């Protein structure tokens, strides 16, 4: 998995991810815990993203 | 306040239908082989994302903080 992480001071973290199935998406982790996933856009908060990550992570 | 509905898929794996308080409807299929399929009812009605175990676990680690 190809992962490019950038620290964005005052905004949070940013992860650019490309899958082996050639699917590109961007994940932004704001300092307020809010998750934003672009591909099309979906926004989650801290608790929700953790639950979904628990499911996804198996 | 997440609403999660889980169903077993005979010969496939598990099905998770998820809705948020922000009302975001997505569907996550976890195959027994390890593959993860994520669906979203958005031009493109139902978008799809395909992952394998390693990829899924990494994205989770990113989302899970």
């Amino acid at each position: 998995l190809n992962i490019k992480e950038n620290d964005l001071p005052g905004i949070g973290k940013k992860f650019e991810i490309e899958t082996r199935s050639h699917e590109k998406m961007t994940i932004i982790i704001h300092d307020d815990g809010r998750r934003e996933i672009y591909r099309s856009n979906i926004s989650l908060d801290d608790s929700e993203a953790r639950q979904i990550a628990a499911i996804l992570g198996g």
Side-chain angles (χ1 to χ4, degrees), chain A residues 41-53:
Chain A
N41 161 74
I42 170 184
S43 184
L44 288 313
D45 65 80
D46 187 31
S47 56
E48 297 181 336
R50 287 184 60 258
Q51 303 185 232
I52 301 177

Side-chain angles (χ1 to χ4, degrees), chain A residues 21-52:
Chain A
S21 55
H22 298 335
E23 306 191 78
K24 299 182 297 182
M25 74 174 187
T26 301
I27 294 183
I28 298 179
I29 310 297
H30 301 258
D31 294 336
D32 47 271
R34 161 185 43 171
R35 270 66 170 176
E36 300 211 312
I37 312 175
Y38 306 88
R39 190 186 185 268
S40 301
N41 161 74
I42 170 184
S43 184
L44 288 313
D45 65 80
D46 187 31
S47 56
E48 297 181 336
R50 287 184 60 258
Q51 303 185 232
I52 301 177

